């Protein structure tokens, strides 16, 4: 198999024999030693590389990304951030000026993350560089550097890559995929790869029969249907957050703390849903807002409430030859709030994840849509708490009274993330949170002035 791409301003044609090989490994084997390996788990951002195509330019993790995915794209690593003549990028110089490096090992990753950010005039550095771990500097000098280089024109040699092109199955369209997966039910489907590639790097697994869904535009669509928004499974979390900015600020506010920017750019909603994780952050949000899932078995097109998809741990309502096609969100959900709790705010998976969405018919609670992650082995609604809330007065004391029912709704687990007691306590904590927020009370720690 043969793919092509623009590696640091020059076209490169590669003969793919091992489809599972990561972009990090390939580059370093090429002697492009500038991209570092910090963890091989998508967590630290030392391997941050800059890809470009029709969609624009973005920073991604080289260790998560597999080669076939960069076909027909413009890859720009650290050894290419500087101009052909040797002149340093505004980002690079500013880091030297503002002592943004110490040991240096995390610098290539930051420079790429900052350059890609500079290329799109993006300025939310907290969120932008959350996926970039530095253990030396305290981040303070890296912020100065970023701000100092922000008052500079974009690199033209980096913008020049835009004028490009204008063993493993790669479907162009959903039809092509549907036919193929129908005959190949045992195949390993790869969307973003931010879960699949961990099996190869950490679990040290081999994967025969592979397909790449990231080259399938009609699967990656956000369309407006009469009933709501039919969001395709190929849509990236970064994209879903961007869309939700308007219609659903609460999901967008939750997706901010989904993974990191380098992961959000390639991780998809279909991947997050088809993974079926009890700690997955997508489903608890979507279930709480009563979103419907759409499954496709070639031509077969089943529909269901998202919560019904998840049967048991490592068990989903998924037919052989059937793939997650799309979700459908309602046009509105103003009663939605989403609380993710973890040790650290950025780049840390949930211990407890509470999404609450109550309807009020003037003081009295009409509908209860309360969903949790990490409280079970499968994302589910708090049945007993929900039921015992219908018709009640919307005040703390009433909610305080129904709180114990959650201990009959869930039996939390203990591990390194949290103790079962705490998980239970924090689930009930999110209910008192929900009431206080709607009563116009200060509750969020992240919204506090220094």
């Amino acid at each position: 198999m043969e793919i092509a791409f623009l590696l640091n301003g020059e076209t490169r044609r590669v003969r793919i024999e091992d489809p599972t090989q990561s972009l990090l490994e390939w580059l370093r084997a090429e002697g492009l030693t500038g991209t570092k390996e910090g963890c091989n788990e998508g967590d630290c951002g030392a391997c941050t590389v800059m890809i470009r195509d029709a969609a624009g330019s973005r920073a991604v993790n080289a260790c998560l990304m597999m080669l076939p995915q960069i076909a027909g794209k413009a890859l720009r690593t650290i050894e290419g951030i500087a101009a052909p003549d040797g002149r340093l990028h505004p980002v690079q110089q500013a880091m030297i000026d503002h002592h943004g490096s110490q040991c240096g090992f995390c610098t290539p990753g930051f420079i790429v993350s900052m350059a890609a950010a500079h290329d799109r005039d993006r300025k939310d550095y907290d969120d932008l560089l959350a996926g970039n771990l530095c253990r030396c500097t305290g981040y303070a000098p890296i912020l100065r550097a970023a701000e100092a280089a922000a008052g500079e024109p974009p690199a033209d040699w980096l913008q020049a890559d835009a004028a490009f092109t204008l063993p493993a199955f790669l479907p162009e369209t959903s039809d092509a995929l549907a036919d193929w997966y129908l005959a190949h039910p045992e195949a390993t489907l790869i969307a973003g790869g931010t879960d699949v590639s961990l099996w190869v790097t950490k679990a040290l697994r081999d994967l025969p029969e592979v397909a790449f869904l990231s080259h399938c535009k009609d699967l990656a669509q956000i369309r407006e249907t009469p009933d709501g928004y039919g969001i395709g499974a190929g849509v990236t979390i970064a994209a879903l957050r961007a869309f939700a900015e308007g219609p659903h600020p609460a999901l967008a506010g939750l997706l901010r703390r989904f993974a990191s920017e380098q992961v959000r750019q390639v991780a998809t909603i279909g991947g997050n849903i088809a993974n079926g994780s009890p700690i997955g952050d997508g489903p608890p949000a979507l279930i709480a807002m009563g979103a419907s899932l759409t499954l496709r078995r070639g031509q077969e097109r089943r529909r269901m409430p998202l919560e019904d998809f998840f049967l048991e741990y490592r068990k989903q309502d998924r037919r052989p030859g059937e793939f997650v096609e799309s979700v459908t969100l309602p046009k509105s959900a103003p009663g939605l709030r989403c609380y993710k709790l973890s040790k650290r705010f950025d780049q840390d998976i949930s211990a407890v994840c509470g999404c609450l969405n109550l309807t009020l018919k003037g003081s009295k609670i009409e509908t209860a849509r309360i969903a949790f992650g990490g409280m079970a082995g499968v994302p589910k609604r708090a049945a007993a708490f929900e039921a015992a809330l219908i018709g009640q007065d919307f005040r703390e004391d009433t909610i305080a009274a129904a709180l114990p029912l959650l201990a009959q709704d869930f039996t939390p687990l203990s591990d390194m993330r949290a103790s079962a007691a705490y998980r239970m306590n924090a689930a009930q904590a999110m209910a008192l949170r929900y009431v206080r927020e709607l009563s116009g009370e200060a509750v969020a720690v992240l919204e506090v002035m220094p």
Binding site: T33, T35, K36, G38, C39, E41, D43, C44, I78, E79, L88, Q93, M95, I96, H99, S101, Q102, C103, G104, F105, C106, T107, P108, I111, Y125, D126, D127, A130, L133, R135, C136, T137, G138, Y139, A140, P141, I142, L143, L204, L341, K343, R344, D346, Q347, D348, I349, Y422, N425, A426, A429, M430, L432, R433, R436, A442, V443, V445, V448, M449, P450
Partner: protein, 760 residues
Amino acid sequence: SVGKPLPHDSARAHVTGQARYLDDLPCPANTLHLAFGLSTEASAAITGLDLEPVRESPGVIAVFTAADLPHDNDASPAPSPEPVLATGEVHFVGQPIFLVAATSHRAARIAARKARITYAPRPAILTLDQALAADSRFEGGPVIWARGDVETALAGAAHLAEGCFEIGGQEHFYLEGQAALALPAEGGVVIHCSSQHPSEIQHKVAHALGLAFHDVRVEMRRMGGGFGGKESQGNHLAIACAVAARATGRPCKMRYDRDDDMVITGKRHDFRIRYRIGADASGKLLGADFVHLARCGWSADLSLPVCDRAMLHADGSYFVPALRIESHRLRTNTQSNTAFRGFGGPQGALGMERAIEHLARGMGRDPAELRALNFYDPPEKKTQTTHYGQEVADCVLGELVTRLQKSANFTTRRAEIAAWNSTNRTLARGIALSPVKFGISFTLTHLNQAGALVQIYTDGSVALNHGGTEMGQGLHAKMVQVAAAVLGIDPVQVRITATDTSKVPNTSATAASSGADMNGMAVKDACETLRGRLAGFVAAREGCAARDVIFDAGQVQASGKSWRFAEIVAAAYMARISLSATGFYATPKLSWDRLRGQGRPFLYFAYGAAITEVVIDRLTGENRILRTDILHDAGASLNPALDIGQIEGAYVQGAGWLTTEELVWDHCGRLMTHAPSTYKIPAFSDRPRIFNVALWDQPNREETIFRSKAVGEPPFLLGISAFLALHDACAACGPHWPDLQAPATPEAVLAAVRRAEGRA
């Protein structure tokens, strides 16, 4: 150019991605790759070892067992042996049992897991209570030091606070992992490795191969972070490569995968500290009785000097007329704990800080005021001594803290928080100030030495080499600045060469913050021998005294005439004068008895103070640092820019240790937090939203390299202020003592909140 805020020596190379770390180095096509096969048992005898599926795994060239080792099987820096490969029995989950030599890094890793091992499990020792009950310890019984009579003082104490709290460990999480490369070179080997102590690497590799020291050469250019974790932990890999290379005939390279790295290597010693502290009616401290329960792991490593520094720093910043410490260095069937930025110091200090905080709260007094009252006295009666009997004739904390409180607007801010708290009931703010008194020097005294080698070439350029290693602390630039200052030339003329045991021998580790301190002097010595030669050459030529020959700004001046530096050197070359010189330094005034707990172990102390402000969530325990204000003493700083960097960095690491960073083992000794997904170091947004770092600018009293002070470790202790402010935030929940445990995770914060509130 000492004092100038110049950049790091490889700043551009970092930014361009052209700086080489071990795994970046080019090496022969036949370079094999190595991986360990780890124990799945915390305490067991090995009954069966079938390595057949390992040998038959693809690409595997050699498989090694303890039996296959030609000589020494010891990697410990301690006098007590620690096997590189397990010898019939395993002592923790992750202990290397066998070594795999395969044609790729993946291949070896894959092959390592295909082991067939049978165990005869024995009872594990995982908690401190088990070790304490079963007497699983080191040094054969505890170490106890006492000054005066604590029991008598505490008996008649106007005020008293008792207490006990946990302090969790800390994984280094240097971005570049542990890594080494062995190159067989005619009878001997060359070792490239990511280590803080190349001289020990030589030592351990030599013994492993049965070679005299002059047959082993360690080169070390830069580390992608070290933080103490590379002071000894590198030994296992360098030995593995040396041994595999000897057998296979090929160059060998080994690097831990992140999960392997966190499971195998040690961490910061976690402590349980019990305290009894007593005060005056005026508020002066009478006595403090401390008990240190330290987790050392399955092996000694560097635990002995680590717990020694915990004790040495159990006075905090305060004069206590009577003080006792009881130090239990307990052995557990977990990872062998090691050095970590602060070296047991931050634990001892925090014990004193938690105690004095509790005391203050107990008598309803402002903690800041109480600490202020109980600092050591300023310079200029006989001088106060520490509990180990060392005079503190350099304590500037009274003056410093005052300055920092005014600049940070402390009193007003505190009141503003009081009001904010009383308007909120879901969110609570907290503010606290904590001081630092960190002693400087290796407590193992003979390690307080450094060497240098300087070359001046005929074109005027300079090659500078020393024993210290660059792990990102800006040591190399600092040395260049010293070298350029002494010679009277522009830093650009001075090039730093990689650390090399065949260039500068018998070096200590780059630790105890003595890197800049000692090596700086060693550089100075070598340069002054060089400057001395050229001055004497010019003097004789121009006819006058050498001390009248002036080296400055790349120019040499004598007899009203002035040459360029290069013009003198070429001339001295023609004249036949040696333009190569060594330099050597050893720290004076140092003498103390480890057992007696008496003497002068340190040359001077490094001081500082931090005011931290935070916010907590009463419902979950979620929390954020909102602002920090630091004033720190770097002496007459050698590089203010680099020094600010070190404080900003160290503070975040200190704070991080006492917040989101938490090590967790299971009921079987299996570390559960072994990936970055589970271990949570400070992320970008985690930085203080306002970060105010200012240097206390005042020369050292002792004769150190340009009156500067070691800034490497001391600012790490400033992270205590964050843990104290988190506690302060809990104090404003209810009337009860919160008893906040370290690390102060969301769960730990919620617990302490509910205690103060009195909710079960």
